[PDB]
């Protein structure tokens, strides 16, 4: 959507289904070249990749479970490989895991929960840092994090849902500091968030372009730190 | 930037010049009929209507002062009469008036500050809101609000601009309302929020201030107007944001406070 | 409720009724001198007068309509020449005024909100500044200035609300203001705002003990710019 | 500072040293009787008990590390079988760790910060809850949560401190969740977010850096631990503020950010 994301490197995580794979599409449209993950392959991911490189971009798919570090790392290590180098980074791995009332959040609740939401994109960005900030020394632009937030991480997470969106607003504050001393490395941080105003519920395709946006150093070069909800007024 | 701004009819209060203007270009450029705003015009008028034809785009100058509200209804009434209706507002019309510390904010003081600011938006948002319902009834998608906010809206006005800082706070508010109870009406509201932009606004800084500032903002300068210009079209856009409203998106290089 | 409150010179607008008079029933009480005010004297201004100060504390009435700057500039002039000085300003005029929505709100709407909850609050500030000032310099201590927001000055105005809220949200930004350049003049600038997990609304009772709290130095003295909200969770 | 605190049981993590020690202290002036805890006894425990109990509160020491949720119920079962109930939490535990810039961010670095200020919060709320429901359910009235925020959770943590800052920016969210769905149960949660203040905590800052940021605070200086306890017990006080909950309440001279 964005003429300078031709020929960029997108490592999107949890982009195997849902807003991530939409993301992903848009990307590679957009000439990109794109990471797909997942913890497993999709059965269809061979007919999905030629959608890709058809579109004018290239794919490759990655597994991983990025609850843990080491996943993490290896991630971002098979990525840099095969593709080269990195200049977005998009944390979309994360979820609800389940929805349990807090008599009931015992330590493998709230370990599921936290490792999936918070380990995941602390690490992965930790490791995927050094590639970012390479890539927009040797441009002289900026790379982009762009992270999946919620509307639970600013009003609270719903039914059973309280470290959820208490998870989300761990990401929301971890960008300022994010911002605060990494800014000097070329590197954006920005947040995507997919009763409502707008009297129906959001498809994935329309969160989409404002990754797309956020990644763009041509659209949003000055833009750093913020948090952009896509709820239709909700 | 995106296709579907070809042919819409953007009208952007206060864009004879900075961030209003390099919005204006942008639009045009992107096909856009663009109203041109300010209260004269400005030297280079033909020029930045030339331009922007050029691109392929369209563009008027109307001339108003938006603090009454008999300003702002004639300023929608030329528009529509000129272009035949709106799919896209932008309140950008506003500024500081000048700096007054509390002890000098008198009724004059005041009344230019909350007219040229907020009164102008309100206004302005009222006399476009039937044409912008309108537009997006027939066209079966969504017509655009966008104001232009400010960092001051956040975290307060600096030195004698402690009205101008609480009447972009009163635009971010206002906008909730808005969304709460237009949105059936096919309208989106958001808000565009400058931090510190190399414009007009802040030509009065010396060059220590504008240093001091430019040392503690994580990008380590002031943003330019180029840079706030495609978050408008963004928002504007309902192929880029059509399930976006009600939302406040700062341009601040990593800046949060004056 | 703080015992240094008392003989603290307690101005609070709007407090012929409602929320403000509970308030100043507490002040008095605490052994302060204050100053009622409204835009007409209550029937009753006698007896709430001598009930306060058989409480302990004292009282006198002052008529104002605070939407002029004029009547701001009165209404503290006179109750300096009542009671010496001013300790605390209590901004609690204003209200709704009337519910109008966007196609019909013209230039007497909106200058009724506007000026009964905005101009109200910046022009006795403004002209209570340099007495507050005063007293703290005095006691090397602090002054206090507490307004009145509302739920609507964060998350909006409901029907025909839309002023109503903005203009809460413009005192919330405007105290920020006023802490940055009157902190250094010792005077503190806090806010008190009077689908519900507590399932019900709150009285006037339970709004008081909050003001109380931020106009007292030994309670609040390092606390200043902030949003008190009483509202059950809403 | 309010008679309704006299007899309540009060339970105060992290409370041998600076604001929670302040903190218990002024609840055991207000005739309360508090639950002191730490890691291990600070040296002055026996002369900070008695000074409680000359006041005519009450005290008692309680040894755990609340980074596992085994710990956790301990403190609880072990704070009620002293006191026999519970009114008022205040969870105050927590702290750095250290200070390492994200590439140094390693499983123990994260799982120590993660654990000492989130896991904590939610485990002892957790097993207190109970007794704060019965507490409240005999009273009438209401018990009380009260959690230790910062600035840092506003406006992110400071170097070093990214995980610190979200922890606690982690802690103003979570408590929304248990506003919707504890309210019923008759607990109010509130938090009070300390700014920059002279405790241990910042004790490692060197003369330069402790007079820059006292330069730019608008009161001129780092708050006292003292400061700090009244909006705690003004949060634990049903008669003070019964219909307030889910309020986080910043005491930071006018800082906001590090």
């Given at each position: 959507m964005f003429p300078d994301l031709k020929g960029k490197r997108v490592l999107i995580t949890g982009?195997?289904?849902?807003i991530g794979l939409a993301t992903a599409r848009l990307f590679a449209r957009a000439g990109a070249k794109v990471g797909l993950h997942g913890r497993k392959a999709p059965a269809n991911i061979d007919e999905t990749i030629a959608s890709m490189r058809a579109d004018g971009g290239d794919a490759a798919f990655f597994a991983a479970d990025l609850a843990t570090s080491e996943a993490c790392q290896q991630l971002v290590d098979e990525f840099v490989a095969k593709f080269?180098?990195?200049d977005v980074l998009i944390n979309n791995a994360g979820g609800l895991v389940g929805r349990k009332p807090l008599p009931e959040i015992d330590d493998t609740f709230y370990d599921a929960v936290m490792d999936a939401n918070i380990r995941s994109v602390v690490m992965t960005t930790k490791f995927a840092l050094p590639h970012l900030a390479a890539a927009a020394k040797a441009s002289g632009q900026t790379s982009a994090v762009i992270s999946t937030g919620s509307i639970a991480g600013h009003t609270g997470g719903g039914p059973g849902a309280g470290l959820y969106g208490a998870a989300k607003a761990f990401l929301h504050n971890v960008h300022k500091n994010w911002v605060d001393f990494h800014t000097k490395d070329g590197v954006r941080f920005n947040i995507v968030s997919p009763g409502i105003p707008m009297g129906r519920f959001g498809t994935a395709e329309e969160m989409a372009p404002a990754f797309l946006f956020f990644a763009s150093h041509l659209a949003?070069?000055?833009?750093?730190?913020q948090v952009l909800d896509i709820n239709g007024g909700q």
């Amino acid at each position: 959507m964005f003429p300078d994301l031709k020929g960029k490197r997108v490592l999107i995580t949890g982009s195997s289904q849902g807003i991530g794979l939409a993301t992903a599409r848009l990307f590679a449209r957009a000439g990109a070249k794109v990471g797909l993950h997942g913890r497993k392959a999709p059965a269809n991911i061979d007919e999905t990749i030629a959608s890709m490189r058809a579109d004018g971009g290239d794919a490759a798919f990655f597994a991983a479970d990025l609850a843990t570090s080491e996943a993490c790392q290896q991630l971002v290590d098979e990525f840099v490989a095969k593709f080269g180098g990195i200049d977005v980074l998009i944390n979309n791995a994360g979820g609800l895991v389940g929805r349990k009332p807090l008599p009931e959040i015992d330590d493998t609740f709230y370990d599921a929960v936290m490792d999936a939401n918070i380990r995941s994109v602390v690490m992965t960005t930790k490791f995927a840092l050094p590639h970012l900030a390479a890539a927009a020394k040797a441009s002289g632009q900026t790379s982009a994090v762009i992270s999946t937030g919620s509307i639970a991480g600013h009003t609270g997470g719903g039914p059973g849902a309280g470290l959820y969106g208490a998870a989300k607003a761990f990401l929301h504050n971890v960008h300022k500091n994010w911002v605060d001393f990494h800014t000097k490395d070329g590197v954006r941080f920005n947040i995507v968030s997919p009763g409502i105003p707008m009297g129906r519920f959001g498809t994935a395709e329309e969160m989409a372009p404002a990754f797309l946006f956020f990644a763009s150093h041509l659209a949003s070069g000055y833009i750093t730190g913020q948090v952009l909800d896509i709820n239709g007024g909700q």
